[PDB]
Amino acid sequence: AHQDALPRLPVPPLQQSLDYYLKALQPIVSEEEWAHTKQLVDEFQTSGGVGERLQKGLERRAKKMENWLSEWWLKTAYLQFRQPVVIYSSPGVILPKQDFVDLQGQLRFAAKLIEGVLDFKSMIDNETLPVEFLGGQPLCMNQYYQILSSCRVPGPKQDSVVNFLKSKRPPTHITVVHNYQFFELDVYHSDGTPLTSDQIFVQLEKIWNSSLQSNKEPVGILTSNHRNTWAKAYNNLIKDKVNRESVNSIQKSIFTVCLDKQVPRVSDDVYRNHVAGQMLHGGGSKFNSGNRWFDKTLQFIVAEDGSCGMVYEHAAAEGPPIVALVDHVMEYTKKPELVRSPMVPLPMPKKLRFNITPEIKNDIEKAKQNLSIMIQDLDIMMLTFHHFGKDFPKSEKLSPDAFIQVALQLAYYRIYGQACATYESASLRMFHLGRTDTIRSASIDSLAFVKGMGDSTVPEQQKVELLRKAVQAHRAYTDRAIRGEAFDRHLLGLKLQAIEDLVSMPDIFMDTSYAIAMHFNLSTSQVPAKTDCVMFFGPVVPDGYGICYNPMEAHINFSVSAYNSCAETNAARMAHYLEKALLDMRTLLQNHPRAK
């Protein structure tokens, strides 16, 4: 009923989008390249031309489908992406560190966490999860029905997803991994009632005692390899009926809980960076990378030292829906432990076995080698910006997110001397089945500001004006994107429509300007959460950065990633310049009051 009342994703007018495209290109391409693209655009949109025909095709597509973009996006962005999901696709999350100091404490917390997710699940099962709004504007809730009891499945050409949430007999178990060993744990009794936190603890204790040694092959590490490689290894793994049953249990589980092992202590200044690594990829074959199943949509990680977090498979949902679950769960783990009814006998959680063959052992070794290379190449820098949060920008009547994005543009320019194609995720949930579109942070106004900011000939008064204009221009682009008026998904649609129409690939998509526009040296996303957490992910290009943040009232949690294979990037440096840019913007604004 709620979904039926939501507006359908629109197809923007052709000229409007192309006009916005030309404006977004101005700061990132040469004068010569822009002039050439301008000519291609004029020809592409001409009356009776190629572009108009494709546009008509997209409009027809919107009339015959619930959402014209959904399937195309899922396929192009995720299912057909063949690189490992680890680092390159699945975002990691670091949650507030817990105070437990030993094994029993680690298990007690895991029990509360599990109970909390099940509490959230009750609202999903009963479709009682409150509809979200944006001031009076309804949001699509479909993503919430794709995260539990689901899993990505390797395919030889493209991947697929399985979702058991609404099956005849929905799964009633979660999977728990300890020392690379997987267990099927029922979290509901036969009578249908959920297990209590105390009962769950008792079961986790059995699981722990049944996996005290780390001498079993880390089959789960196979899920971290290239999708072509895993597709083949997967097909071979499940040829054996027992292995197939074990994989089936993992795929069907409501979610997976990873009880990680102790790891070497590191200097306090790089601790959070190492924890982020643990949450994103596991740290390596000798640490916790084998204590995972990366195809799983939801994986909660409880570390030996109190740290906790999670990693989720991106084909399922975006950051906001995931943090909605996080906020609900963390809040639940803080609730007073009420009366505990007389417990009852519990079954032995089933240890999922894997019959290893020389072939499977080889695949596992190859996966370890591949992951080692990936981890060595990742550069992560976690930054807790304590100076201020949403409070300062708000006091200046400036959008906090826009303020942060402009600061990132300033930091990038200060390091590189030029702007770069920049991506910021925009939520399209105001539309039925809406996922995301692109907000382009590098603009005519942002470039004018960053140049003016560092120009020793431009008066500070002018720098201030340029600052506000850039921030408001970004806010405007953000508002347009959320209302389905951005142009990136639209252009992608036109390209996919051309492919489906069996017409020659239009020149506008083969243009050097389009290649530049689609190569994001800065890939970013704001994921606000009530919980003091932070999300992170790998860059989308070899010479880029992956930046995510959670703006709180008085501070901001930042993550910055980069690849070591690119000598031109450095996560720490980027983080430091971002911190300084934010501070310099506050300083400038405070030194030039609007009324006194």
Coordinates of C-alpha atoms in Angstrom, one line a residue:
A1 CA 0.0 0.0 0.0
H2 CA 2.7 2.4 1.0
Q3 CA 4.8 1.6 -2.1
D4 CA 1.8 1.9 -4.4
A5 CA 1.4 5.5 -3.3
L6 CA 5.0 6.5 -4.1
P7 CA 5.8 8.4 -7.3
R8 CA 7.6 6.4 -10.0
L9 CA 11.2 7.3 -11.0
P10 CA 11.1 10.0 -13.7
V11 CA 13.0 10.4 -16.9
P12 CA 14.4 14.0 -17.0
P13 CA 14.1 15.9 -20.3
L14 CA 16.9 15.3 -22.7
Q15 CA 18.2 18.9 -23.2
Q16 CA 18.0 19.7 -19.5
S17 CA 20.2 16.8 -18.6
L18 CA 22.7 17.5 -21.4
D19 CA 22.9 21.1 -20.3
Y20 CA 23.6 20.1 -16.7
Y21 CA 26.2 17.7 -18.1
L22 CA 28.0 20.4 -20.1
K23 CA 28.1 22.6 -17.0
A24 CA 29.5 19.8 -14.8
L25 CA 32.2 19.2 -17.5
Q26 CA 33.5 22.8 -17.5
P27 CA 35.7 22.5 -14.4
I28 CA 37.2 19.1 -15.4
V29 CA 38.0 19.1 -19.1
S30 CA 40.1 21.4 -21.3
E31 CA 38.6 24.3 -23.3
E32 CA 39.3 22.3 -26.5
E33 CA 37.6 19.1 -25.1
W34 CA 34.6 21.1 -23.9
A35 CA 34.1 22.8 -27.2
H36 CA 34.2 19.4 -29.0
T37 CA 31.7 17.9 -26.5
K38 CA 29.4 20.9 -26.9
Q39 CA 29.3 20.1 -30.7
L40 CA 28.6 16.4 -30.0
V41 CA 25.8 17.4 -27.6
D42 CA 24.2 19.7 -30.1
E43 CA 24.2 16.9 -32.7
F44 CA 23.0 14.2 -30.2
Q45 CA 20.0 16.2 -29.1
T46 CA 19.0 17.6 -32.5
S47 CA 15.4 17.3 -33.7
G48 CA 14.8 14.0 -35.4
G49 CA 18.2 12.7 -34.2
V50 CA 19.7 9.8 -32.2
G51 CA 19.3 11.3 -28.8
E52 CA 15.6 12.1 -29.2
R53 CA 14.8 8.5 -30.3
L54 CA 16.7 7.1 -27.3
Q55 CA 14.9 9.5 -25.0
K56 CA 11.5 8.4 -26.4
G57 CA 12.7 4.9 -25.7
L58 CA 13.5 5.6 -22.0
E59 CA 10.1 7.3 -21.5
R60 CA 8.5 4.2 -23.0
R61 CA 10.5 2.1 -20.6
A62 CA 9.2 4.1 -17.6
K63 CA 5.6 3.6 -18.8
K64 CA 5.9 -0.2 -18.8
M65 CA 8.0 -0.8 -15.7
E66 CA 7.7 -0.1 -12.0
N67 CA 11.1 1.7 -12.1
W68 CA 12.9 2.2 -15.4
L69 CA 16.4 2.1 -13.8
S70 CA 16.2 -0.6 -11.1
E71 CA 17.2 -3.7 -13.0
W72 CA 19.7 -1.9 -15.3
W73 CA 21.5 -0.4 -12.3
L74 CA 21.5 -3.6 -10.2
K75 CA 23.1 -5.4 -13.2
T76 CA 25.6 -2.8 -14.3
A77 CA 26.7 -1.5 -10.9
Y78 CA 26.9 -4.9 -9.0
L79 CA 25.9 -8.2 -10.6
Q80 CA 28.1 -7.6 -13.7
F81 CA 31.0 -6.1 -11.7
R82 CA 33.5 -8.9 -11.6
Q83 CA 36.2 -7.6 -9.2
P84 CA 36.2 -9.1 -5.6
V85 CA 33.4 -7.7 -3.5
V86 CA 35.9 -7.3 -0.7
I87 CA 37.3 -3.7 -0.5
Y88 CA 36.0 -2.8 -4.0
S89 CA 32.2 -3.2 -3.3
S90 CA 31.2 -4.2 0.2
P91 CA 31.4 -1.3 2.7
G92 CA 32.7 -1.8 6.2
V93 CA 31.5 -0.2 9.4
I94 CA 33.2 0.4 12.7
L95 CA 30.8 0.6 15.6
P96 CA 31.5 2.1 19.1
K97 CA 34.0 0.0 21.0
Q98 CA 32.4 -2.1 23.7
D99 CA 33.8 -2.6 27.3
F100 CA 34.0 -6.4 27.5
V101 CA 37.5 -7.6 28.5
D102 CA 37.4 -11.3 28.0
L103 CA 35.8 -14.3 26.1
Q104 CA 32.6 -14.5 28.1
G105 CA 32.1 -10.7 27.7
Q106 CA 32.6 -11.0 24.0
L107 CA 29.9 -13.7 23.8
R108 CA 27.5 -11.8 26.1
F109 CA 27.7 -8.7 23.8
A110 CA 27.3 -10.9 20.6
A111 CA 24.1 -12.4 22.3
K112 CA 22.6 -8.9 22.9
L113 CA 23.5 -7.9 19.3
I114 CA 21.8 -10.9 17.9
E115 CA 18.7 -10.3 20.0
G116 CA 18.7 -6.7 18.8
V117 CA 18.7 -7.6 15.1
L118 CA 15.9 -10.1 15.7
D119 CA 13.9 -7.3 17.4
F120 CA 14.4 -5.2 14.2
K121 CA 13.5 -8.2 12.1
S122 CA 10.1 -8.5 13.9
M123 CA 9.1 -5.1 12.4
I124 CA 10.2 -6.3 9.0
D125 CA 8.3 -9.6 9.3
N126 CA 5.1 -7.8 10.5
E127 CA 5.6 -5.0 8.0
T128 CA 5.3 -2.7 11.0
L129 CA 8.5 -0.9 10.3
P130 CA 7.6 2.8 10.4
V131 CA 7.5 4.6 7.0
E132 CA 10.3 7.2 6.8
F133 CA 9.9 10.7 5.5
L134 CA 11.8 13.9 4.7
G135 CA 9.6 16.5 6.2
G136 CA 6.4 15.2 4.7
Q137 CA 7.8 13.3 1.8
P138 CA 7.4 9.4 1.9
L139 CA 10.4 7.2 1.2
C140 CA 10.6 3.8 -0.4
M141 CA 11.0 1.0 2.2
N142 CA 11.9 -1.8 -0.2
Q143 CA 15.6 -2.0 0.8
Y144 CA 14.7 -3.1 4.3
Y145 CA 13.2 -6.2 2.8
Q146 CA 16.4 -7.3 1.0
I147 CA 18.9 -7.3 3.8
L148 CA 18.0 -10.2 6.1
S149 CA 18.1 -13.9 5.1
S150 CA 19.7 -13.0 1.8
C151 CA 23.0 -13.7 0.1
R152 CA 24.8 -13.0 -3.2
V153 CA 25.5 -16.0 -5.3
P154 CA 28.4 -16.4 -7.7
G155 CA 27.5 -16.9 -11.4
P156 CA 29.8 -17.7 -14.4
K157 CA 28.6 -14.6 -16.4
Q158 CA 27.0 -12.4 -13.7
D159 CA 26.0 -12.9 -10.1
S160 CA 22.6 -13.3 -8.6
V161 CA 20.9 -12.7 -5.2
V162 CA 18.8 -15.1 -3.1
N163 CA 16.3 -13.7 -0.6
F164 CA 14.5 -16.1 1.8
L165 CA 12.8 -13.5 4.0
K166 CA 9.3 -14.2 2.5
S167 CA 9.7 -17.9 1.6
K168 CA 7.1 -20.6 2.5
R169 CA 9.2 -21.5 5.6
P170 CA 11.4 -18.5 6.4
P171 CA 14.8 -19.4 7.9
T172 CA 14.9 -19.3 11.7
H173 CA 18.7 -19.6 12.1
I174 CA 21.7 -17.3 11.8
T175 CA 25.2 -18.5 11.0
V176 CA 28.1 -18.0 13.5
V177 CA 31.7 -18.2 12.4
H178 CA 34.5 -18.8 14.9
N179 CA 38.1 -19.8 14.0
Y180 CA 36.9 -20.1 10.4
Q181 CA 34.3 -22.7 11.4
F182 CA 30.7 -22.1 10.5
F183 CA 27.7 -23.0 12.7
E184 CA 23.9 -23.0 12.1
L185 CA 22.2 -21.5 15.1
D186 CA 18.5 -21.5 15.5
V187 CA 17.4 -18.2 17.1
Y188 CA 13.7 -19.1 17.5
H189 CA 12.2 -22.0 19.5
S190 CA 9.9 -24.6 17.9
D191 CA 7.0 -22.8 19.6
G192 CA 7.9 -19.7 17.5
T193 CA 9.2 -17.6 20.3
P194 CA 12.7 -16.0 20.0
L195 CA 15.6 -17.2 22.1
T196 CA 16.5 -14.9 24.9
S197 CA 19.9 -13.2 25.2
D198 CA 20.8 -15.7 27.9
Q199 CA 19.8 -18.7 25.8
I200 CA 21.7 -17.3 22.9
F201 CA 24.7 -16.9 25.1
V202 CA 24.5 -20.5 26.2
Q203 CA 24.5 -21.5 22.5
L204 CA 27.4 -19.3 21.6
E205 CA 29.3 -20.9 24.4
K206 CA 28.7 -24.3 22.9
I207 CA 29.8 -23.0 19.5
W208 CA 33.0 -21.6 21.0
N209 CA 33.8 -24.9 22.7
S210 CA 33.2 -26.7 19.4
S211 CA 35.7 -24.5 17.5
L212 CA 38.6 -23.9 19.9
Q213 CA 41.3 -24.8 17.3
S214 CA 42.2 -22.9 14.1
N215 CA 43.3 -25.9 12.2
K216 CA 40.4 -26.2 9.7
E217 CA 40.7 -24.8 6.2
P218 CA 39.3 -21.3 5.8
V219 CA 36.7 -22.1 3.2
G220 CA 35.1 -18.6 3.7
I221 CA 38.2 -16.9 2.3
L222 CA 37.1 -18.2 -1.2
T223 CA 34.4 -15.5 -1.1
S224 CA 37.0 -12.8 -1.3
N225 CA 38.4 -13.7 -4.7
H226 CA 37.6 -12.3 -8.2
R227 CA 34.1 -13.1 -9.2
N228 CA 35.1 -15.2 -12.2
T229 CA 37.5 -17.2 -10.0
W230 CA 35.0 -17.6 -7.2
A231 CA 32.2 -18.6 -9.6
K232 CA 34.3 -21.6 -10.7
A233 CA 35.5 -22.5 -7.2
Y234 CA 31.9 -22.2 -5.9
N235 CA 30.5 -24.5 -8.6
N236 CA 33.2 -27.0 -7.6
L237 CA 32.7 -26.6 -3.9
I238 CA 29.0 -27.4 -4.1
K239 CA 29.4 -30.5 -6.2
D240 CA 29.6 -32.4 -2.9
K241 CA 26.2 -32.7 -1.2
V242 CA 27.5 -31.9 2.3
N243 CA 29.3 -28.8 1.0
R244 CA 26.1 -27.8 -0.8
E245 CA 24.0 -28.1 2.3
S246 CA 26.5 -26.1 4.3
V247 CA 26.6 -23.3 1.7
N248 CA 22.8 -23.4 1.6
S249 CA 22.6 -22.9 5.4
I250 CA 24.9 -19.9 5.2
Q251 CA 23.0 -18.3 2.3
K252 CA 19.6 -18.8 4.0
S253 CA 20.7 -17.6 7.5
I254 CA 19.1 -14.4 8.8
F255 CA 22.6 -12.9 9.1
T256 CA 26.1 -14.0 10.0
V257 CA 28.0 -13.2 13.3
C258 CA 31.7 -13.4 13.2
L259 CA 33.5 -14.0 16.5
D260 CA 37.0 -12.9 15.7
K261 CA 40.3 -14.0 17.2
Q262 CA 42.9 -11.9 19.1
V263 CA 45.3 -10.0 16.9
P264 CA 48.7 -8.4 17.6
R265 CA 48.6 -5.1 19.4
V266 CA 49.5 -2.0 17.3
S267 CA 50.5 1.5 18.1
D268 CA 47.6 3.6 19.3
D269 CA 48.0 6.1 16.4
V270 CA 47.2 3.4 13.8
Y271 CA 44.7 1.4 15.9
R272 CA 41.5 2.6 14.4
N273 CA 43.0 2.2 10.9
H274 CA 43.8 -1.5 11.7
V275 CA 40.3 -2.0 13.1
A276 CA 38.8 -0.5 9.9
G277 CA 40.9 -3.1 8.0
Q278 CA 39.5 -5.8 10.2
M279 CA 36.0 -4.8 9.5
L280 CA 36.5 -4.3 5.7
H281 CA 38.6 -7.3 4.8
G282 CA 39.5 -9.3 7.9
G283 CA 43.2 -8.4 8.0
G284 CA 44.6 -11.3 6.1
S285 CA 44.7 -15.1 6.1
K286 CA 46.5 -15.4 9.4
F287 CA 44.1 -13.0 11.1
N288 CA 40.3 -12.9 10.5
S289 CA 39.7 -12.9 6.7
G290 CA 38.8 -16.6 6.9
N291 CA 36.2 -15.9 9.6
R292 CA 33.8 -14.6 7.0
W293 CA 31.5 -15.3 4.1
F294 CA 31.6 -12.1 2.0
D295 CA 28.7 -13.1 -0.3
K296 CA 26.5 -12.7 2.8
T297 CA 24.4 -9.5 2.8
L298 CA 24.8 -8.8 6.6
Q299 CA 27.9 -9.8 8.6
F300 CA 28.3 -8.5 12.1
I301 CA 31.8 -8.7 13.6
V302 CA 32.6 -8.9 17.3
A303 CA 36.3 -8.5 17.9
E304 CA 38.4 -10.1 20.7
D305 CA 39.4 -6.7 22.2
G306 CA 36.0 -5.1 22.4
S307 CA 35.9 -3.6 18.9
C308 CA 32.9 -4.4 16.7
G309 CA 31.5 -3.5 13.4
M310 CA 30.1 -5.1 10.2
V311 CA 30.5 -5.4 6.5
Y312 CA 27.6 -5.6 4.1
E313 CA 27.1 -6.8 0.5
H314 CA 26.2 -3.8 -1.6
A315 CA 23.9 -5.4 -4.2
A316 CA 21.2 -5.4 -1.4
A317 CA 21.1 -1.8 -0.1
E318 CA 22.6 1.6 0.5
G319 CA 24.2 3.0 3.6
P320 CA 21.2 4.7 5.2
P321 CA 19.0 1.6 5.5
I322 CA 21.9 -0.3 7.0
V323 CA 22.6 2.3 9.6
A324 CA 18.9 2.4 10.5
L325 CA 19.4 -1.2 11.5
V326 CA 22.6 -0.3 13.3
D327 CA 21.0 2.5 15.3
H328 CA 18.2 0.2 16.3
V329 CA 20.5 -2.6 17.3
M330 CA 23.1 -0.6 19.2
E331 CA 20.3 1.2 21.2
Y332 CA 18.8 -2.2 22.0
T333 CA 22.1 -3.5 23.4
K334 CA 21.9 -0.6 25.9
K335 CA 18.4 -1.5 27.2
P336 CA 18.0 -2.7 30.8
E337 CA 18.2 -6.5 31.0
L338 CA 14.7 -7.4 32.3
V339 CA 13.6 -10.6 34.0
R340 CA 14.7 -13.9 32.4
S341 CA 12.0 -16.6 32.3
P342 CA 13.2 -20.1 33.4
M343 CA 15.4 -21.3 30.6
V344 CA 14.9 -24.5 28.7
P345 CA 17.0 -27.3 27.1
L346 CA 18.7 -26.1 23.9
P347 CA 19.9 -28.2 20.9
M348 CA 23.5 -28.4 19.9
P349 CA 24.1 -25.8 17.2
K350 CA 25.0 -27.6 14.0
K351 CA 28.6 -27.3 12.9
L352 CA 28.6 -26.9 9.1
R353 CA 31.2 -29.2 7.6
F354 CA 33.1 -28.8 4.3
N355 CA 34.7 -31.8 2.6
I356 CA 38.0 -30.6 1.3
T357 CA 39.7 -32.0 -1.8
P358 CA 43.1 -31.1 -3.3
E359 CA 41.2 -28.9 -5.8
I360 CA 39.4 -27.0 -3.1
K361 CA 42.5 -26.7 -1.0
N362 CA 44.3 -25.2 -4.1
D363 CA 41.4 -22.7 -4.6
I364 CA 41.7 -21.7 -0.9
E365 CA 45.4 -21.1 -1.3
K366 CA 44.9 -19.1 -4.5
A367 CA 42.3 -17.0 -2.6
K368 CA 44.7 -16.4 0.3
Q369 CA 47.3 -15.2 -2.2
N370 CA 44.8 -12.9 -4.0
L371 CA 43.6 -11.3 -0.8
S372 CA 47.1 -10.8 0.5
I373 CA 47.8 -8.7 -2.6
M374 CA 44.6 -6.7 -2.2
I375 CA 45.3 -5.9 1.5
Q376 CA 48.9 -4.9 0.8
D377 CA 47.6 -2.4 -1.7
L378 CA 45.0 -0.7 0.5
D379 CA 45.8 2.5 2.4
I380 CA 43.3 3.6 5.0
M381 CA 43.2 6.7 7.2
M382 CA 40.5 7.1 9.9
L383 CA 39.9 10.7 11.1
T384 CA 37.8 11.9 13.9
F385 CA 37.3 15.5 13.2
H386 CA 36.7 16.8 16.7
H387 CA 36.8 20.6 16.0
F388 CA 33.1 20.9 15.1
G389 CA 30.2 19.0 13.5
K390 CA 26.9 20.0 11.9
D391 CA 26.7 22.8 14.6
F392 CA 29.0 25.2 12.8
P393 CA 27.6 25.1 9.3
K394 CA 24.1 25.3 10.7
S395 CA 25.1 28.5 12.6
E396 CA 26.1 30.0 9.3
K397 CA 22.9 28.9 7.5
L398 CA 24.9 26.5 5.4
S399 CA 24.1 22.9 4.7
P400 CA 26.5 20.7 6.7
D401 CA 26.9 18.1 3.9
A402 CA 27.4 20.8 1.3
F403 CA 30.0 22.5 3.5
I404 CA 31.9 19.2 3.9
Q405 CA 31.8 18.5 0.1
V406 CA 33.2 22.0 -0.7
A407 CA 35.9 21.5 1.9
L408 CA 36.9 18.2 0.2
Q409 CA 37.1 20.1 -3.1
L410 CA 39.4 22.6 -1.5
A411 CA 41.6 19.9 0.0
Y412 CA 41.9 18.1 -3.3
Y413 CA 42.7 21.3 -5.2
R414 CA 45.3 22.2 -2.6
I415 CA 47.1 18.9 -3.2
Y416 CA 46.7 18.5 -6.9
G417 CA 46.3 22.0 -8.4
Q418 CA 43.2 21.0 -10.4
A419 CA 39.7 19.7 -9.7
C420 CA 38.7 16.1 -10.4
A421 CA 35.5 14.3 -11.3
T422 CA 33.8 13.8 -7.9
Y423 CA 31.0 11.5 -7.0
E424 CA 28.6 11.9 -4.0
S425 CA 25.8 9.4 -3.6
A426 CA 22.3 10.8 -3.6
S427 CA 19.3 8.8 -2.4
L428 CA 16.4 8.4 -4.8
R429 CA 14.2 6.8 -2.2
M430 CA 11.4 9.4 -2.7
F431 CA 10.6 7.2 -5.7
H432 CA 9.3 3.6 -5.8
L433 CA 12.3 1.2 -5.7
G434 CA 14.7 4.2 -5.9
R435 CA 18.3 3.6 -5.1
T436 CA 20.9 6.3 -6.0
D437 CA 21.9 8.9 -8.5
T438 CA 25.1 11.1 -8.7
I439 CA 25.7 14.5 -7.2
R440 CA 28.8 16.0 -8.9
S441 CA 30.8 18.0 -6.3
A442 CA 33.3 19.5 -8.8
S443 CA 31.4 22.4 -10.3
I444 CA 31.9 25.8 -11.9
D445 CA 31.3 27.4 -8.5
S446 CA 33.4 25.0 -6.4
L447 CA 36.4 25.5 -8.8
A448 CA 36.0 29.3 -8.6
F449 CA 36.0 29.0 -4.8
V450 CA 39.0 26.7 -4.5
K451 CA 41.1 28.8 -6.9
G452 CA 40.0 32.1 -5.2
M453 CA 40.7 30.6 -1.7
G454 CA 44.4 30.0 -2.6
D455 CA 44.8 33.1 -4.8
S456 CA 46.9 35.7 -2.8
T457 CA 45.4 38.4 -4.9
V458 CA 41.8 37.7 -4.1
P459 CA 40.4 39.7 -1.1
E460 CA 39.1 37.6 1.8
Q461 CA 35.7 39.2 1.4
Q462 CA 35.6 37.7 -2.1
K463 CA 36.8 34.3 -0.9
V464 CA 33.9 34.4 1.6
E465 CA 31.3 35.1 -1.1
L466 CA 32.8 32.4 -3.3
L467 CA 32.6 30.0 -0.4
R468 CA 28.8 30.5 0.2
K469 CA 28.1 30.4 -3.5
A470 CA 29.9 27.1 -3.9
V471 CA 28.1 25.6 -0.8
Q472 CA 24.7 26.7 -2.0
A473 CA 25.3 25.5 -5.5
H474 CA 26.1 22.1 -4.1
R475 CA 23.0 22.2 -2.0
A476 CA 21.0 22.9 -5.1
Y477 CA 22.5 20.0 -7.0
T478 CA 21.8 17.8 -4.0
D479 CA 18.1 18.8 -3.9
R480 CA 17.8 18.3 -7.7
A481 CA 19.4 14.8 -7.5
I482 CA 17.1 13.6 -4.7
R483 CA 14.1 14.8 -6.8
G484 CA 15.2 12.8 -9.8
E485 CA 16.6 15.8 -11.7
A486 CA 20.3 14.9 -11.8
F487 CA 21.7 13.6 -15.1
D488 CA 24.1 10.7 -14.4
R489 CA 21.7 7.8 -14.3
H490 CA 19.8 9.4 -17.1
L491 CA 22.9 9.4 -19.4
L492 CA 23.6 5.8 -18.4
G493 CA 20.0 5.0 -19.3
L494 CA 20.4 6.5 -22.7
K495 CA 23.5 4.5 -23.3
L496 CA 21.8 1.2 -22.2
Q497 CA 18.8 2.1 -24.3
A498 CA 21.1 2.5 -27.4
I499 CA 22.5 -0.9 -26.7
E500 CA 19.0 -2.4 -26.4
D501 CA 17.9 -0.6 -29.5
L502 CA 20.7 -2.2 -31.5
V503 CA 21.9 1.2 -32.8
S504 CA 25.6 2.2 -33.1
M505 CA 27.1 3.4 -29.8
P506 CA 26.5 7.2 -29.9
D507 CA 29.6 9.4 -30.1
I508 CA 28.8 11.3 -26.9
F509 CA 29.5 8.2 -24.9
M510 CA 32.8 7.5 -26.7
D511 CA 33.9 11.1 -26.1
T512 CA 37.1 11.7 -24.0
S513 CA 35.0 14.1 -21.9
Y514 CA 32.6 11.4 -20.9
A515 CA 35.5 9.1 -20.0
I516 CA 36.9 11.9 -17.8
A517 CA 33.5 12.6 -16.3
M518 CA 33.0 8.9 -15.3
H519 CA 36.5 8.4 -13.8
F520 CA 35.9 9.4 -10.1
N521 CA 39.1 10.3 -8.4
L522 CA 36.9 11.2 -5.4
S523 CA 34.1 8.7 -4.6
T524 CA 32.1 9.8 -1.6
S525 CA 29.0 9.3 0.5
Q526 CA 27.5 10.8 3.6
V527 CA 25.9 8.2 5.9
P528 CA 24.4 10.0 8.9
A529 CA 23.8 7.8 11.9
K530 CA 22.6 8.3 15.5
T531 CA 25.3 5.8 16.5
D532 CA 28.8 7.3 16.7
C533 CA 30.0 5.0 13.8
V534 CA 31.8 5.4 10.5
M535 CA 31.6 3.6 7.2
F536 CA 34.4 3.0 4.7
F537 CA 35.1 1.5 1.3
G538 CA 37.8 1.3 -1.3
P539 CA 38.4 3.9 -4.1
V540 CA 36.6 3.2 -7.4
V541 CA 39.6 4.0 -9.6
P542 CA 43.3 3.1 -9.1
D543 CA 44.3 6.8 -8.7
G544 CA 41.4 7.7 -6.5
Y545 CA 40.1 7.9 -2.9
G546 CA 37.0 6.5 -1.2
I547 CA 35.7 8.9 1.4
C548 CA 32.7 8.4 3.7
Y549 CA 31.5 10.4 6.7
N550 CA 29.0 10.6 9.5
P551 CA 28.4 14.2 10.7
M552 CA 27.4 14.4 14.3
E553 CA 26.4 17.5 16.1
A554 CA 29.9 18.5 17.5
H555 CA 32.2 16.3 15.5
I556 CA 32.5 14.4 12.2
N557 CA 33.7 10.8 11.7
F558 CA 35.7 10.4 8.4
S559 CA 37.3 7.5 6.6
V560 CA 39.7 7.9 3.6
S561 CA 41.0 5.1 1.5
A562 CA 43.6 5.0 -1.3
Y563 CA 45.6 2.4 -3.2
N564 CA 49.4 2.1 -2.7
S565 CA 49.9 1.1 -6.3
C566 CA 49.3 4.8 -7.1
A567 CA 52.2 6.9 -5.9
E568 CA 50.1 10.1 -6.4
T569 CA 47.6 9.3 -3.7
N570 CA 48.0 9.1 0.1
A571 CA 45.1 8.6 2.5
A572 CA 46.7 10.3 5.4
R573 CA 47.6 13.4 3.4
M574 CA 44.1 13.6 1.9
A575 CA 42.6 13.3 5.4
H576 CA 44.9 16.0 6.8
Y577 CA 44.2 18.4 4.0
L578 CA 40.4 17.8 4.5
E579 CA 40.7 18.6 8.2
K580 CA 42.7 21.8 7.4
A581 CA 40.2 22.9 4.7
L582 CA 37.3 22.5 7.0
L583 CA 39.1 24.6 9.7
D584 CA 40.1 27.2 7.1
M585 CA 36.5 27.6 6.0
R586 CA 35.3 28.1 9.5
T587 CA 38.1 30.6 10.2
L588 CA 37.3 32.6 7.1
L589 CA 33.6 32.7 7.9
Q590 CA 34.1 33.7 11.5
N591 CA 36.5 36.5 10.5
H592 CA 33.8 37.9 8.2
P593 CA 30.5 38.1 10.1
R594 CA 27.3 38.9 8.2
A595 CA 25.9 41.4 10.8
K596 CA 28.5 43.4 12.8

